[PDB]
Design a protein around this ligand. Sequence first.
Ligand SMILES: [Pt+2]
Ligand SMILES: [Pt+2]
Ligand SMILES: [Pt+2]
Ligand SMILES: [Pt+2]
Ligand SMILES: [Sm+3]
Ligand SMILES: [Sm+3]
Lengths: 512, 512
Amino acid sequence: MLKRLQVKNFRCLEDIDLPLGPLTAIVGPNGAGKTTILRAIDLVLGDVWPSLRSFRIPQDFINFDTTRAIEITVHFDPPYTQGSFNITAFRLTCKGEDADFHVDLEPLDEGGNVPRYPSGNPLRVGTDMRNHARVLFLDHRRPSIRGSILGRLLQPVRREFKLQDNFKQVYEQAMDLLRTEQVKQIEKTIAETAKQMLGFLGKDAMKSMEIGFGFADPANPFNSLRLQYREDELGLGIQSAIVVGIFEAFRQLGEKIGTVIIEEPEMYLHPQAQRYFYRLLCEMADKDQCQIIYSTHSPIFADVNRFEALRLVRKDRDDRVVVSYVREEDKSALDNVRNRFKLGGRFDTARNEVLFAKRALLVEGYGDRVAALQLFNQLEVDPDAECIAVVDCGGKAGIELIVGVCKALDIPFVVVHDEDVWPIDERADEETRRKQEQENKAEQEKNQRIQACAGAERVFVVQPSLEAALGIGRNASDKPYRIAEILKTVDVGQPPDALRPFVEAIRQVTRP
Amino acid sequence: MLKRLQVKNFRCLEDIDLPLGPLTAIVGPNGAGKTTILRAIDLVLGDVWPSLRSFRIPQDFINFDTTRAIEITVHFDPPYTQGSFNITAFRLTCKGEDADFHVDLEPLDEGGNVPRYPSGNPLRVGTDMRNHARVLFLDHRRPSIRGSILGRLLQPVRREFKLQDNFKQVYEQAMDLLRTEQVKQIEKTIAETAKQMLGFLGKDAMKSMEIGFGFADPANPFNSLRLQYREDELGLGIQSAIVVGIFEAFRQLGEKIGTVIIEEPEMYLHPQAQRYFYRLLCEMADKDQCQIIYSTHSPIFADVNRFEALRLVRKDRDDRVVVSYVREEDKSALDNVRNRFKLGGRFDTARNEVLFAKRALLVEGYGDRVAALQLFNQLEVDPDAECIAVVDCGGKAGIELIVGVCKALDIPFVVVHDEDVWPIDERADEETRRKQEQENKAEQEKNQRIQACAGAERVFVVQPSLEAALGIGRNASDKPYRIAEILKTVDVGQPPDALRPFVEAIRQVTRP
Ligand SMILES: [Pt+2]
Ligand SMILES: [Pt+2]
Ligand SMILES: [Pt+2]
Ligand SMILES: [Pt+2]
Ligand SMILES: [Sm+3]
Ligand SMILES: [Sm+3]
């Protein structure tokens, strides 16, 4: 599998370095580098040998510069053994001094050096070596489909095939029904003309070449097989559905298929089908049957609970592309937080919207979101137009989790939550007093952990709780019409003292 | 045929407006707008219906702006009649206020307005209307080929086809040799999964859909036919040769095929094959059998004698794309100059290099070029590295022609030529004296015409001639070794007075 990508001076990617894992989910705004990361991988490892014909000069250089060298380095594991060399990466360079540019594909060892022979010449990247690490690229290709993707599916079929001779005779029999006299004269005009054009190259005989009409190589028929259907946004959805079916056949066939890159796996799938596809891709990645690298705009394919997969790509104040992800050092602390949330917590795909927003307001629960959005409306802010995600995190442990992801990804955020500490009723019985004390301490610990990960300047605490600030019963705590009519009597100008941290949280997350 | 293209705010094309003719040859440096012109036409008239899915937002807006509206207008002739409307152009707009963008395809009448019905609603662009003007786009697609290009070739074949029933039974017979038990289980997994993904859309039955393997629609087999060969730069050349063969079949079939756009018709063809292809494209355009619009880097496809075809595209001091061409007003004067050159003049493809250069030095003849290039070498300038074309124009009338094209195209240039006026030998006989006088006046007229079109500040005159300045005989006037050894004794520092206009011409064309 691919392990790491380095890109220098390629289109919008001035300098970038990101890890790659069994599932790599790449998110970020349009034009901010997302697709260019994928194209850089395809340049080195796609099915066209990297050469000067692979680049647009100067289109592919930063600023159309060309005094800078394009450099794409792809690292992988396990190493490729060539004789006495173990190669762990390829480095594709395109540079030049005007006006002769050139590209090199160099092999690199564990230590980042190009091995050389005792003769002193460097080791060059050969066919077997590059095909070692080749990737399937599913870009938006989506009444028929075909590609190296289906080809890889049929390669166990193409193997045990044993009726090649019979197929040739039936195939030719069918081609003869097509070869009208006019068809043959059209074919002869094409083939004779092409051969004359080729003759100018001087390479002869060359007269061994057959050029004609047909719809398959009868020797290797499974190389022209496609999926087809009878009968366009409808057509596009059908072709997306057939792709899901192809991947479902892979999973049942169990064969390892290596590295697949997908531009927007969601496209033209119903959300329910996107859920089915994502679950399928995750099973194959986790089972170690392939590696999936993709760009996505869908919160169904960008799961906050799988935070190791996340790469967030965007341009900084200076139009410099920057990639964010959970650092290795930090994975274990966030994983602990993910586990604490899984005890009693429930997962919610809607929370993944945090990954697509300019800014996030993190709240505990459904009632808090309803109240937040009504206050937005009273402050005359539309959170959808401002790309502010208001995220129901599923309680305090859930907030910790989303905070840790936002912190690791450099997503700006504000937290609001209740204090949930209550004075002890000195008249209650021993068990109630003791349990109140213990609950207060537990809540204080949860409040302190949120403060430690978010920072205090990003956290607003409603004392003792939003329910108490609103005067709202326990029954009605989540009824939107009840929350709305209470909040409609409040004055955003001077929100009550109890309610003040809630509306100030919304003012902070709104502040440009 | 397409008549005109207007592009506003699309990628690098801030504002541009160019005529389109039966042959349109688009030249200019890489990234300077050449290919973007072609892509803009394809957006409106390619085989994908223009919609919001056609654009990259913000990638396709100038500066990734999106506060500006993309506008592509394609004009054509003859008009399309829809009921009582005559449409002569389509206008594709993509704009929006964040964050909902949208695209409109509007029909336009003779006067540039969108017709509306008595109801007041505008006329919309329908299928038949847009297909009226659809273009074949041959982009770099180049062991098999296929596209709407071959499809258009076979459409007279697909017509008179009458063995559909027999073909179905032989075709299925061949598919049965492939359908192993494992193949059928793979196919059932694909089809059942795709149908389940489609079922989430709610559209039912939908159970009428057949999804399976195959290599043709047995009902319409000529829609899956391809050209193939046995067996990659060699492969790329073969596929280019097959394209030439397809166009040669078109010319023999005589059917009109409308508008074809080609990205770099030269690519992977031998120069001799490029000459064959260009001649073929010109016959079809002149015979009115199609319209060819292409970008090119080849002087074989960009003929200075066909100056009406030329469009030169480049970025000005400010990175603003500017297109140049011979204006309508000016065509008749340049055509007169082209005719005067055709009496006794000989054509030379090498002269087309003027169209690809940063600057051109225009000289009369072969001996003048040799001398120019040797002086470049003595001035320690490499004209190839500086993109200076030294152009042998074929005599003074030939210089007029190239000057007129360079002037119309805004190519910077310098002219050097001989005066060729000689004192009359008062001892000669009457006929020689009279002929000398008449030749002097003829030469003076030719010298004056060059001065009128080039401007005097761009013209250097060697008095009486370079041969006389060099002291070189008539025999040796064109022998490079003789010219070189004479020039090697000259001092670029203070070239003789007779030679001075020649070396000063070279210093001017070299001056940044
Ligand atoms: Pt980009
Ligand atoms: Pt891109
Ligand atoms: Pt461009
Ligand atoms: Pt481009
Ligand atoms: Sm609460
Ligand atoms: Sm001369």
